[PDB]
C-alpha cells in the first residue's frame with residue numbers, strides 16, 4: 001500500500017496533463033513501447049491525442065471513482081470513470097481501464113488506445129460529422145424583425161474579366177461610380193495578398209437595388225446576419241463576429257464556422273440564439289466502418305427572442321436625435337415594457353458584421369462622440385428632472401407644504417456665509433415661489449432650500465425607497481444607480497446639489513424611467529422589462545399617493561403654462577405631463593462647460609407611455625424638448 005498510493009497519484013497527474021491540453025507531458029508518464037508495457041512510443045502518443053482530442057475539440061477532462069489495486073509483481077491495474085466536453089456536448093459515464101508498471105520507485109502507465117476512448121481496440125479511428133445550427137432571430141413586440149439571418153446580395157469582382165490593362169482601370173472606375181465606392185479601393189481589393197487571377201474578390205454588400213454591372217462585375221447571393229433597423233438599434237441589438245480559434249478553446253460547443261454575439265443582445269443571448277450543434281461522434285474500424293457511436297443528436301435551431309421594443313418607436317426615437325450625442329427611453333410605465341432604447345451617435349451593424357474595412361472601424365473608435373456607447377445604460381446626473389423625486393419625498397414626510405410660499409430675492413442664494421463663494425443658482429427671478437411655481441420655472445433655489453430643511457436623514461430615508469444601488473433584471477450591462485460616492489454627503493453644499501439633480505448622482509436613462517414610473521402608478525415603482533414574456537415586477541409604496549396627485553397636476557402646467565419650461569409641447573394638443581432639465585458637467589477636455597439637456601414626459605390621463613430623452617454635451621439652444629414632438633405623437637396615438 002506504500003506504493004499503491006504513489007500509483008493513484010500517477011493516474012491523477014496523467015489525467016491532469018491531458019485535461020491541461022499538454023499531451024506531451026502526459027506521454028512522458030507512459031512506459032516504454034512494448035507488448036506488455038505501452039502500446040506506442042511517447043511521440044506517437046502525443047500525435048494520437050492531439051489528432052483525436054483536437055478533432056473533437058475535447059476540453060475539461062474530469063475523472064472520479066478511482067480504484068488502484070495490484071495484479072502482479074510490478075503490475076498494478078487501475079480503473080476510473082470519466083467525463084469530458086466535446087464539440088457535441090458532454091460525454092458522461094465513461095469507463096476507463098488499464099494497467100500501471102512500477103519497475104522501480106517510479107510508476108509509469110502501460111499506455112493503450114483504450115485510454116483515448118473506452119472501447120478503442122488497437123488501430124481504431126475516430127470520425128466527427130457536424131451539422132451547423134441556424135442562429136435564432138430577435139423580434140419586437142409585434143413580430144417585426146430586429147436581428148435575423150437574411151439573404152443578402154454581395155458585389156464582388158473577378159480580375160480576369162475586368163479588362164486587359166487600360167480597360168481594367170476604366171472598369172474599376174466604372175464600378176466605383178455605379179456603387180458609391182472609393183475607386184482606389186477597387187484596385188486595393190483586387191491587389192491584396194490573397195488574390196489570384198480567376199478569383200472572386202468581394203468589395204461591399206449591396207443595399208437593395210442592383211445597378212448596372214460594368215466590365216467584370218458580378219453579384220453573389222450570400223447568406224449572413226442582417227439587422228433591418230441598423231444604427232437605430234445597433235447599441236441595443238449588437239453585432240455578431242466570426243468565431244475564432246481562441247473562442248472554441250473557451251467554449252467548444254460553438255460552431256467553428258458559425259457566428260458569435262460580440263455586443264448587445266446578440267452577445268447576451270448568444271446561447272439561446274446560436275442553438276446547439278448537431279452531429280455524430282463515432283469510433284470506426286480500419287476504414288469508415290462505424291464501430292461504436294459515442295455521441296449523436298439532431299441539430300437544434302436557435303430560439304427566437306421577442307422584445308418589448310416597438311420597431312416604429314425605436315426608429316423614430318433614434319431619428320429624432322439627428323445624429324447628435326444622446327439617448328431616448330420609452331416605456332409603458334404601468335408594465336415596464338421598454339418600447340424603445342435608442343443611443344446616438346451610432347454605428348452601422350450590417351457593415352460591421354458583413355465586411356468592415358480596416359479604416360472604417362478605426363473611425364468608429366477614433367470618433368470622440370463614441371458611437372459604441374449604449375447611452376441608455378450610462379449613469380448621468382439626472383438634472384432638474386430630479387426635483388420631482390425631491391418634492392415627492394418632501395411631501396411624504398410633510399417637510400414641503402404645497403401652498404407655503406418661500407420668498408426668494410435674486411438669482412443666487414446660500415445657506416450661511418460658511419459656503420464661501422458657492423451659491424445655488426436659478427434662472428427665473430420670481431419673488432413668490434410655491435411648489436407649483438418652482439416646478440414650472442424649474443427653480444433650483446426652492447429645491448435646494450427644501451432639501452436642506454428636510455435634512456439628510458429624512459432625505460435619504462425617502463431616496464432609499466427607490467432603486468438606488470439595485471441591479472435591474474435586464475439583459476443590459478449597467479452599473480446600479482447611486483445617491484453619492486459614500487453613504488453620507490457630509491456637506492450642506494452637496495446635500496443641496498443632490499436636491500436638484502446634480503452633485504454625485506448617477507442614474508442611467510433606463511433607471512430614470514424606472515424611478516419616474518411612480519407618477520404613473522400612484523407611487524408604485526414598476527420595474528422595466530425588455531423580454532416580452534417576463535412577468536411585471538413592481539415595488540409598492542415608494543412615494544405616497546398624496547404626492548403623486550399633487551405633482552402630476554403641477555407637471556401638466558410645466559407644459560400648459562406660458563412660462564413653463566416645456567411650453568413648446570403645447571402645440572401637440574395632447575394630454576402631457578413633463579419636466580425638463582439641463583445639468584452641467586465639468587469637462588476636463590476644455591474649460592468651456594458641457595451641459596446635458598433632459599426631458600421626462602408621459603400621458604397623465606391613461607398612463608399608456610412614459611418617455612425619458614437626453615442630449616449629451618448639447619449644442620447651443622438645442623434641447624431634448626425640441627425633438628420630442630414626433631415620438632410623443634406616436635406614443636400617444638399607439639399606447640393609451
Ligand SMILES: *C(=O)[C@@H](NC(=O)Cc1ccccc1)[C@@H]1N[C@@H](C(=O)O)C(C)(C)S1
Pocket residue numbers: 383384385425427441442443444500565579580581582583584595598
Ligand atoms: C435644472 O437643470 C435647472 N437649472 C440648473 O441646474 C442650472 C442651469 C444649468 C445649465 C443651464 C441653465 C441652468 C433648471 N432646469 C432647466 C431645464 O428645465 O431645462 C432650466 C434651464 C430651465 S434651469
